Amino acid sequence: GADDVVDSSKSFVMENFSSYHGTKPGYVDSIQKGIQKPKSGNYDDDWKEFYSTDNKYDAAGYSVDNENPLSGKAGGVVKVTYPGLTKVLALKVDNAETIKKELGLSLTEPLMEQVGTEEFIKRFGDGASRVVLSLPFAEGSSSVEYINNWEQAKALSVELEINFETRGKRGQDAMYEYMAQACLSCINLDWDVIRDKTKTKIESLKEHGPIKNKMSESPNKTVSEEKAKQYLEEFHQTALEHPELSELKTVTGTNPVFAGANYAAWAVNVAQVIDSETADNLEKTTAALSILPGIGSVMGIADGAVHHNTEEIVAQSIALSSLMVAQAIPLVGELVDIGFAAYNFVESIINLFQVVHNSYNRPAYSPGHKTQPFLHDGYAVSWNTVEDSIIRTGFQGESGHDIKITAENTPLPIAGVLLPTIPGKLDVNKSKTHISVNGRKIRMRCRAIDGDVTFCRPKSPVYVGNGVHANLHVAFHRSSSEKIHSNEISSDSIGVLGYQKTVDHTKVNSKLSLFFEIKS
Amino acid sequence: GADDVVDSSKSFVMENFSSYHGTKPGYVDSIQKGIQKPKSGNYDDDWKEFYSTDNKYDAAGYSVDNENPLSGKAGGVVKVTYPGLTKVLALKVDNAETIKKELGLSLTEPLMEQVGTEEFIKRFGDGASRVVLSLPFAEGSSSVEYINNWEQAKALSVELEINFETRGKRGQDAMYEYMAQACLSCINLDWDVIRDKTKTKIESLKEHGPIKNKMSESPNKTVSEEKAKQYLEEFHQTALEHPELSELKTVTGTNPVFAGANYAAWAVNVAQVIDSETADNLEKTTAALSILPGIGSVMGIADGAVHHNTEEIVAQSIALSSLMVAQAIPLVGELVDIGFAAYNFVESIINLFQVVHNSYNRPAYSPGHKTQPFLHDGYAVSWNTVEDSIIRTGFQGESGHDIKITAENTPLPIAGVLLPTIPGKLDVNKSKTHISVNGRKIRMRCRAIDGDVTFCRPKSPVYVGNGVHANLHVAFHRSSSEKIHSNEISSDSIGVLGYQKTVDHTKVNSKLSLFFEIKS
């Protein structure tokens, strides 16, 4: 029925309904004369339309130069307003055939065509001058996408929200500073400060005796990739000794992702894929750099956290990466000017920083929460469904909870599982708790540890891998209707235990965590 | 309603309804006198019951000695038959409160109690002498689990299906040879042959000049773990040169998982966790060995396939592993007799082989098929739902397909995606195809490659990692109602491309495959 394709709760009517539209450079002024369909030349006749959104910051992402989409200039965002009263109709599905059939409309005329006809709107407009469809912007987003009938969009009034090119910043800085307003702490850095600090640090580092000497030491010739990495590793060790890098050094030691070997491999990789034509063009540089592994070493991003979180540390890491890439270019080839390290290398990587910082500033589930997998030591585990991750409380009775388990290649063991328990309010049903391995149901033997943890081991050995997967089913029983209190529990996760290894001279199992939420 | 908890299609009535029950050693004869509730001492008052199954081979898995569940003897399987007519009632959920409420029965008396009362059965039995509940055995399984009211189970007639101890085989060989009857080729090996071949190969290998000399060379002293691994690696290289290992050598070279370094690390790991008490006890040996990583090297299992698939190669790998572990024991400690390498080491690992071979012999989805993830190079990708993996054909209109993407730690790029296409019958809708990164919707630029592939790249750089995940949404449009024909397509997978690397002196992207099925 129509409620299968339309959400009446999120449908509504508004007077002067406004929304936002990202606009490419060169059209920021011309679009403000009026919304008009572009010239001929698509993918779905039913979906011809003019697109807008409720989120001006999402709209800013569609404003970059189409001929240089990765690195080009952003135009701006305009606000577009319908005069009068508009019915926004929220959809539950984006399939034109389903929407057409379930709304009793003609299946022979494009959906978006009919949305714009006087019939359809006297019928669905609830007294509105026009009808605009709505859809969920995307998975992981709360924004709203608006689909406007072109003709009806002629009625739109258009004005400026922001012109990114009037700010006169370098690269895409204005666009990303704007998007950062869409609101782990937060990374909201000043990139003019970072760029100036980076140039300053590069010039200043290059005038140190030890670094100058290291520079001389270079083969300054094409040499094998392992020799190049060894020299670059040495260079990194030298430069990090200097005080303009002191903060970097301190973050460097807290994580192997940040070690000199990883900077060396990144710098060698960069020099290997940047030829003279690419070095001269920001877009081509960005496309090349953007497909390399290892950028988290330069970015100080590991374990879900952005560790290079101040303008000072970021400028230090970019400065150091720049001079390492300058050192690596003559060790891989002869035909590329090392000016790339100071110019488009810095310009491009600054752009990549802003993309990734932008991702980490958006709400997202951590590994092991809801349906995001926990990936670790070659395993993948995850809650089968979102409800599995909720442990309901305040009632007598049972619940069951499914956890998917597998591994990437060779067979890896599952040693057991650490579960929460609370006498009366949350006991493990050890009859109904089991692990199914390619459909072989394996029962468990469990013992209590302290008072709030039950540890269960399979009664036959469990292995998972390419082609062998498992379902861990956890059954809890509740003899009391008393609500669980958030300190009767000492962890917020179920701990699946993988293979045994030695961490700092102690034998422990690989830990695979599924985070739960107690509710109700 | 009752149809929310009961499946009338899989419910039925049978005359002389029989099923199977795994029986622990010492109870195979006594159980055949009659089914009886054991003495007092559970987890859910509603679920007191006697359990059976439709699959005698699954039942065989519950027949092992409870005091030695990993490695102990298996009793057998008995067939249990109800005289007369039984109503089997299939359930859709295993929650006693939900089942009780929805079936209009009392919520104050255990479910399984009421199942056994004359009331409930005149009412649901459709003229049956008793009522037995049914449930899905497990995830990934097609077997059926039966839950029998104890009292009503007094009526059961019991006979022998198999006594595993009468076969008089070593270890658990009878149980696993039986389970293998439950039916990539298949691994159905004769383990008496393997054991005899293994003893023979060990004795024969130990009498070679080169291997004897290598033996002398050993420090024969406790030494560092890296020195031990170096010597063991040398030893492995020596033994593989001898003709009784020729088949092993040939499989050895086809895969780095099988290289001498991995055997050495396994053998060192084993020697490190086996003390004298553990070496003397099969169950304790098995519990220790079963939680180690790396067993696929000895098993020849990698990439979803069992490469050591003949009695000859398996006996060669176990023989070689045995003598390596004999060499590693004095290099880690002084208090353990190397007789462990020949006795319980071989006994235990044979048991682990049978467990894993048993897993690979069961039907299962490969990585990237249905909802099993494809794990590779630190990424995880998967179909969001099972229907996403189906591309329907034979109609004009659109479909959409969601692929979850993330990575395990530091930010890794998504370079683009390779998609199937067929003019008219399956075109990419490049307006509605996009990738959402923590809710940031990124559009694509696509180009055709040949005639049946469309390659799409994001218009802003995509990275994923701990805390950053993506949804790839693929929209197809169909201008013809003609059914896709299975040679208009040259691959059965969508290819997500990750970071760039060099494979045999060529630059390629990490390949992440989502396998689809064309249907309808």
Short mmCIF file of C-alpha atoms in Angstrom, two decimals, chain A residues 12 81 121 171 213-214 218 220 233 260 275 308 326 349 360 364 423 427 458 489:
data_model
loop_
_atom_site.label_atom_id
_atom_site.label_comp_id
_atom_site.label_asym_id
_atom_site.label_seq_id
_atom_site.Cartn_x
_atom_site.Cartn_y
_atom_site.Cartn_z
CA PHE A 12 4.76 17.62 5.87
CA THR A 81 13.20 28.68 -1.76
CA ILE A 121 -0.49 17.62 -6.59
CA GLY A 171 43.21 24.61 -2.37
CA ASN A 213 75.14 16.14 6.23
CA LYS A 214 72.61 13.36 5.91
CA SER A 218 72.52 10.20 -0.04
CA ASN A 220 71.72 10.80 -5.07
CA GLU A 233 64.72 5.44 7.41
CA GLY A 260 60.38 5.67 10.50
CA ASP A 275 56.34 11.29 -12.90
CA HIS A 308 48.17 14.44 14.91
CA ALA A 326 62.51 15.18 -1.81
CA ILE A 349 48.48 15.74 0.88
CA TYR A 360 36.47 11.29 11.44
CA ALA A 364 29.95 6.73 13.07
CA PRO A 423 22.93 -13.24 39.41
CA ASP A 427 22.53 -15.42 33.79
CA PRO A 458 33.63 -24.90 23.08
CA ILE A 489 28.75 -4.95 34.91
#
